[PDB]
Amino acid sequence: NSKATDDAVGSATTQSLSFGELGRLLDVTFDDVIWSTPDGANNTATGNDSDTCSTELSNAGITDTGLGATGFTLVETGAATGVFVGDFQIPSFWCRVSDTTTTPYTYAGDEETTTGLDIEVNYVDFRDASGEIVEVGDSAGVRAN
């Protein structure tokens, strides 16, 4: 909770540089916002009622509070294949990040459904075909019936 690379695939060791954050390799977002667990010092907002977003999720039986809590890892398919695969399961509710410019993040006071929001994954290539730093991504839609 004391580093800018929280709930993302990468390293706790990090630095702030021009291209972005040096310890970040991959992360997952709902509605272009980092999918993170409501933990730390800035999770005291209760929203409309007197219940904080963290206990608000717990009452719904959700254990997949963020990407770090699903046990998501990138695993290489072979010893020297160069292809990495990870997986996890979409939750019913999630807690939005109000402000990303503070460490730890500040979380909202009310849980929100994941239905009708897009899901995205972002990968940062430290070395492209030219040896320079670029970010690439993919998107998809969460639906309901």
């Binding site: 021009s18 030219s130 320079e132 670029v134």
Partner: protein, 62 residues
């Protein structure tokens, strides 16, 4: 930020998402947007510094 489209092209490209709200003020339909670049070192200048020339681009929200 800007990056060349090859080793020797002199052409730089960037991908920008059209914002919803820049400064807590939301954009309107058909709004006039101007892109301005100050080329310190135009054809006019003898050294980089000296004179300037402004190159403009206009774009619309639908």
């Amino acid at each position: 930020d800007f990056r060349e489209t090859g080793d020797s092209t002199g052409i730089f490209q960037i991908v920008i998402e059209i914002p919803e709200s820049l400064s807590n003020d939301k954009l309107e339909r058909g709004e006039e947007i101007i892109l301005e670049y100050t080329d310190w070192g135009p054809s006019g200048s003898d050294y980089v510094g000296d004179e300037d020339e402004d190159v403009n681009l206009t774009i619309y929200t639908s």
